[PDB]
Each structure stands twice: as C-alpha cells, then as structure tokens.
Design a protein around this ligand. Structure first.
Ligand SMILES: CC(C)CNC(=O)c1ccc(Oc2nc(Oc3cccc(C(=N)N)c3)c(F)c(N(C(C)C)C(C)C)c2F)c(C(=O)O)c1
Ligand SMILES: *[C@@H]1O[C@H](CO)[C@@H](O)[C@H](O)[C@H]1NC(C)=O
Ligand SMILES: OC[C@H]1O[C@H](O)[C@H](O)[C@@H](O)[C@@H]1O
Ligand SMILES: C[C@@H]1O[C@@H](O)[C@@H](O)[C@H](O)[C@@H]1O
Ligand SMILES: [Ca+2]
Ligand SMILES: [Ca+2]
Ligand SMILES: [Ca+2]
Ligand SMILES: [Ca+2]
Ligand SMILES: [Ca+2]
Lengths: 254, 116, 139, 75
C-alpha cells in the first residue's frame, strides 16, 4: 500500500495473509469461516500446492500474538477463462482445511448479492484497500497491516483520465479502477488478492480484489481491481461444491 | 456499464442566475423617494419556508437602481433605496439584483420599469 | 376618437390599456428608456397557463418561469411525485441492506445471511455473535 | 444506445434543471449527481425526458460543486 495508514489492529478483521512455504505471498479476504477470496494471478508460479497457509487475525508480521489463527489451504479455485501472465478474470476462491473461529479480531467481510453490488455499492465513492504489500513500487513491504481509502471510477472516466501506455492491458467488464492519478496513493505489489471493501449503511461488503496497475501510484494511472460483482453466482455455486482430490481447480465460468 | 456523458461542473452559489426583480413600491417622502424591492424568493428551503435571495447571499447581494436627459444610479445593501428628487418632476425606476463579487453572470435582468 | 384628446399618459395608454412600442416611445422620448420599459412590458406572463402542477407556485421571468413546489413534489413543473419514487435504484429503496423491486406493488427489503429483517421492514439486525461486515472492536 | 450530449445547466434562484440531447429512440435515461467526494445519487429514473430537475439535490448545500452524468439504457 502506497500512501496509506496502519490499519489499527483488529479494524481490518477480514484481511487474510497468504503464505507459500512460510513465505509472504499475497493477501485475501475472509467471507465466511472456511472460504477466502483472493487473486488468481497470485498462484501463477505455485509448485507446492500442499504448502499453502492462510493466516487470520494477523497484524504485525514481526510478532505473534494470541489473535492469530492459521489454516491450511485445502483448495484453490480459479476461472478456467483466466490466463496465467495476464489480467482478466483475476480471482481465486480458497477453501480452508478447517474453519477459523470468529473473534473480535477475525470477522468475515460480506459477499453481497450481485444487483445490490451493481446498483448501490458501485456508487459509494470511497472504499478501503489493504495489505502488507510494498510501501513504494520497488520498495520494502510493510510489517504492520496498511489500509487506504480510494475513490472508484466508472471505466469510461478511468480510460479518459489515464495516460496512454503502449502495451497496457485492457480494462474489461470484469475490472474497475479506483485510486488517484497524482502519484500519491495506490495499492501495490504484494497487496494483490487483498480486499477492496465498501461501507454501506452500517455494514462492510466485498466489492473488489487488489489486482493490478501500472507501477504503484504512477502519475496518470489508477489501481485496477477485480469486479467481484461479476462473480457472485460463480462463487456461491462453488462454495457449495464438493472437495476435489487435487488442490488447484480450474472451474468453468460463467 | 452503460454509455453516459458527464455534465460541466456546477456551483449553485456562484452560477445560478439571479431572478428578475420586481419593484414592490415607490413612495415620495418630502424631497426624496423610497423605492422598495420585493424579496426575491429562492428554491432553498428552511422549515416549510423558502429563503429569499437576501437570506442566501447576505452581504454578497446588493440591488442597483436605475432612474431618470441622462440617467442616474443608486445602490443598496438592503432592499430599499432613498433617493433625492426634484418636486413636481416625474421619475421612472428599474432595479437589478447584483452579486458584485462575481465576474460572470453578476447581474439579473432589469425589473419592469415603474414611473411616478 | 374622443378618447384620443386626453394628453399622453403612460398609466392610461400602457397600464390601463395596451400600447404599442411607438406609443410608449412617444412617452419616454428616448430609445434607451423606452426599450428598457418594453423589454418587460411586451414579454408576457409565462405563468398565465398555470404550468406549476400539484399545488406549486409560479413566478414569471423573461420568457420563462420558475415553479416553487410543495415538499412532496419536484420537477420543472412540480410534475414529479416523490411518494412514487420508492424503487431500489433510488437510494437502495431505503433498504439498509438488500432491496427487491416488485412491479404492481411495493418494494421489499431483505438482509444478508447472519441478519434478520426488523419490523420496520427496512432495517437489519445481527442474528449471530459475529455477523459479516461488522468491526467488533468498534461496535 | 447513444450517449447524451450538450448537457447544459439551467438555473435561476437555485431552481436547477439539467438539460441534454437527444430525444430518445428506443432508450431511456437516468441521471446521477454528486459532489467531488460524495456518493452518487440517482434521479429521474428511466425517463424519456431530456431534462432532470436537480433542485432538491443542489439546495442541500448551494456552495458545493456538483457534477452530474446522464446514463443511456436500451429500452
Ligand atoms: C513478498 C511479496 C510482497 C512479493 N512482491 C513482489 O515482489 C511482487 C512482484 C511482482 C508481482 O507481480 C505483479 N505486480 C503488479 O503490481 C501491482 C499489483 C497489484 C496492484 C497494483 C496497483 N498499482 N494497484 C500493482 C502487477 F500489476 C502485475 N501484473 C499482472 C499481470 C496483474 C501486470 C499487469 C504485469 C504483476 F504481475 C507481485 C504481485 O502480483 O503482487 C508481487
Ligand atoms: C420604505 O418602504 C419600505 C416598505 O414599506 C418600508 O419598510 C421602509 O420603512 C420605508 N423607508 C423609508 C425610506 O421611508
Ligand atoms: O403547460 C406547459 C407550458 O406552460 C406555459 O405555457 C409555459 O409558458 C410554457 O413554457 C410551458 O411549456
Ligand atoms: C409552494 C406553493 O407556493 C404558493 O404557490 C402557495 O400558494 C402554495 O400553497 C404552495 O405553498
Ligand atoms: Ca503477528
Ligand atoms: Ca396612445
Ligand atoms: Ca389607471
Ligand atoms: Ca411617434
Ligand atoms: Ca414574463
């Protein structure tokens, strides 16, 4: 996260830390006691699918306290339409081997209904994005969870307000831009998979997933997030699916 | 997302047009004339009641009087003018709402003309 | 023609009766003042047709008017009934969480799992200790 | 669908109406208005009119700067 603030311990309770063989990999969002939503591109180079751990109640990566809960990732589901190395359909649904226990420090973010998300949440200007990612594009990562308030843009505006770049990825219907183009604030590498959470009439909902951008907080550019509303049905169905043998599962989409 | 178009930015206080005023009355008082401008009602509400242009703009709003061979002008921080006139002579009046601090759209259209 | 013996009079010629430009000009004896008078005099009262609906008030302007509406109405001519705008696209239909439109009748409100719709038909309250989307340490 | 154009603000004594073109043919409009940092509020839902009274929204704070947008939806 570039230009954000430390999320006071316990105030970003749905934030998930994903580890691969004990090393920091990506972020994620808890939506219930056993399912976590993350980004598909976070698993492009995974080889040891059996060494995937999800940590809840985490805050300071340098100290362990009694609020932290760890669970093995039993399954990783990604849209078969996703193409490693690219940006479209950047979403992953993770099934934990054992459910976490909800506490004052571990709470799931609400996965909203599609229409509610498209007609109402999409028009709340600001939302929170968070993670232990890089504090500057090529800089160091954060030890304490960081959070940032970013304003959302309809894609037409995003395109008209962004500096034209040669081989830049298209902003599809499965994405949306949020942030600032003045080079001051943005999500960044490592934050990938984390939540873009929207507050509406007293409750917080999952509206986006930290996905990509052109260099963190680069002038003339906004951060790009996976448009979760397009995957509500897809996610709900899969969460009712039966456990497969292998870890990785490329499920059909729609 | 649907196709759409953005409008220009709009700041009400600085851009809404000032309505055409109406001279409420003009009474001769000795060697002077008291010209009163009717309170211009606006769409801004406040407890089942509409605020006047005066209530909204306060000191930013003034009214200008055009009366009369050349013409003379008078200005007021309220909604009333008290001008010196020559007895036996007939005068005509017209008023205009003005927000001097503006650079564009600073004045309303002139009110209907009223003569003695 | 016996009326035309009475000396010029703005009051009798233009205020009581209707007068022409030159008639008015012959009174003001000056293009500038005459036109200033004419601008409004010949403009007409756009409020004549009573454009403001649902009990609104009309205020004439130059070649236009303004409608002041009662609290429950809006629109150029107060034609919009605020009471008929209770639909999900309008501020979520007043629903705290989910909104469902129902053509023919009225919209209903619903809640996310872990919550239950209250009596008011629009608010939602937790049915579990840790409902989704709430921050315990701040609650 | 065709995007609206020539969006113009018509405002006198705060009675504020947004106007635009073109008259619709097999499409309807919905307008949204907001302040630079506030949420978008919808008005004139699925209208075939080419105007939208926004008075009630702008009088909430006449000193704020508002931006409106007109959406086109296929009928
Ligand atoms: C220890 C950890 C913090 C590891 N961090 C690292 O060193 C690290 C190195 C590289 C890396 O890959 C990577 N990082 C990107 O930056 C990001 C990722 C997420 C958000 C933004 C933003 N500006 N809001 C930028 C990418 F936009 C892409 N693309 C893809 C295709 C979406 C572009 C479009 C090519 C990408 F692959 C990540 C990551 O994915 O988070 C992390
Ligand atoms: C002028 O007329 C107004 C309107 O009645 C009145 O309130 C005010 O006291 C008068 N002042 C003068 C100059 O006599
Ligand atoms: O009834 C609608 C009409 O009312 C009045 O005639 C107005 O002058 C006119 O502008 C409006 O179109
Ligand atoms: C807003 C309207 O204003 C005038 O038209 C009054 O005569 C009406 O009763 C109404 O209050
Ligand atoms: Ca820790
Ligand atoms: Ca005559
Ligand atoms: Ca008479
Ligand atoms: Ca003549
Ligand atoms: Ca008129």
């Amino acid at each position: 996260i570039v230009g954000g603030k430390v999320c006071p311990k316990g105030e970003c309770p749905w934030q998930v830390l994903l580890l691969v063989n004990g090393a920091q990999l990506c972020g994620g969002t808890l939506i219930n006691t056993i399912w976590v939503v993350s980004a598909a591109h976070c698993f492009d180079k995974i080889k040891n699918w059996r060494n995937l751990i999800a940590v809840l109640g985490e805050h300071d990566l340098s100290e362990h306290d009694g609020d932290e809960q760890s669970r093995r990732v039993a399954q990783v589901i990604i849209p078969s339409t996703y193409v490693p190395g690219t940006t479209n359909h950047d979403i992953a649904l993770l099934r934990l081997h054992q459910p976490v226990v909800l506490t004052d420090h571990v709470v799931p973010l609400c996965l909203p209904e599609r229409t509610f998300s498209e007609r109402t949440l999409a028009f709340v200007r600001f939302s929170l994005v968070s993670g232990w990612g890089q504090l500057l594009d090529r800089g160091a990562t954060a030890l304490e969870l960081m959070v940032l308030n970013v304003p959302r843009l309809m894609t037409q505006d995003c395109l008209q307000q962004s500096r034209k770049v040669g081989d830049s990825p298209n902003i599809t219907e499965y994405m949306f831009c949020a942030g600032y183009s003045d080079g001051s604030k943005d999500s960044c590498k490592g934050d990938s998979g984390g939540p873009h959470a929207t507050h509406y009439r007293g409750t917080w909902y999952l509206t986006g997933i930290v996905s990509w951008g052109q260099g963190c907080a680069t002038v003339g550019h906004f951060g790009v997030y996976t448009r979760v509303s397009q995957y509500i049905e897809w996610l709900q169905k899969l969460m009712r699916s039966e456990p497969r043998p292998g870890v990785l599962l490329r499920a059909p989409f729609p | 997302e649907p196709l759409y178009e953005n409008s220009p930015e709009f700041t009400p206080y600085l851009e809404t047009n000032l309505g055409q005023p109406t001279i409420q009355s003009f009474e001769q008082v000795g060697t002077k004339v008291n010209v009163t401008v009717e309170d211009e009602r606006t769409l801004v509400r406040r407890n089942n009641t509409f605020l006047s242009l005066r209530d909204v703009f306060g000191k930013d709003l003034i009214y200008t009087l055009y009366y009369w061979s050349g013409k003379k002008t008078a200005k007021t921080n309220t909604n009333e003018f008290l001008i010196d006139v020559d007895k036996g002579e007939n005068y005509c009046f017209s008023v205009q709402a003005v927000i001097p601090s503006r650079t564009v759209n600073r004045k309303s259209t002139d009110s209907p003309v009223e003569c003695m | 023609f016996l009326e035309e013996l009475r000396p010029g009079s703005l009051e009798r010629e233009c205020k009581e009766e209707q007068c022409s430009f030159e008639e008015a000009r012959e009174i003001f004896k000056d293009a500038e003042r005459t036109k200033l008078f004419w601008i409004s005099y010949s403009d007409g009262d756009q409020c004549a047709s009573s454009p403001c609906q649902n009990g609104g008030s009309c205020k004439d302007q130059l070649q236009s008017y303004i409608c002041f509406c009662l609290p429950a109405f809006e629109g150029r001519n107060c034609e919009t009934h605020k009471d008929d705008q209770l639909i999900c696209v309008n501020e979520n239909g007043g629903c705290e969480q989910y909104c469902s439109d129902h053509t023919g009748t009225k919209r209903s409100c619903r809640c996310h799992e872990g919550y239950s719709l209250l009596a008011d038909g629009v608010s939602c309250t937790p049915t579990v200790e840790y409902p989704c989307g709430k921050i315990p340490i701040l609650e | 669908t065709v995007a609206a154009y020539n969006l113009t603000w018509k405002s006198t004594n705060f009675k504020t109406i947004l106007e635009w073109e073109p008259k619709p043919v097999n499409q309807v409009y919905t307008v949204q208005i907001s302040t630079k940092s506030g949420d978008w509020k919808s008005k004139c839902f699925y209208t075939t009119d080419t105007e939208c009274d926004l008075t009630d929204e702008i009088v909430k704070d006449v000193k704020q700067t508002y931006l409106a947008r007109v959406f086109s939806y296929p009928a």
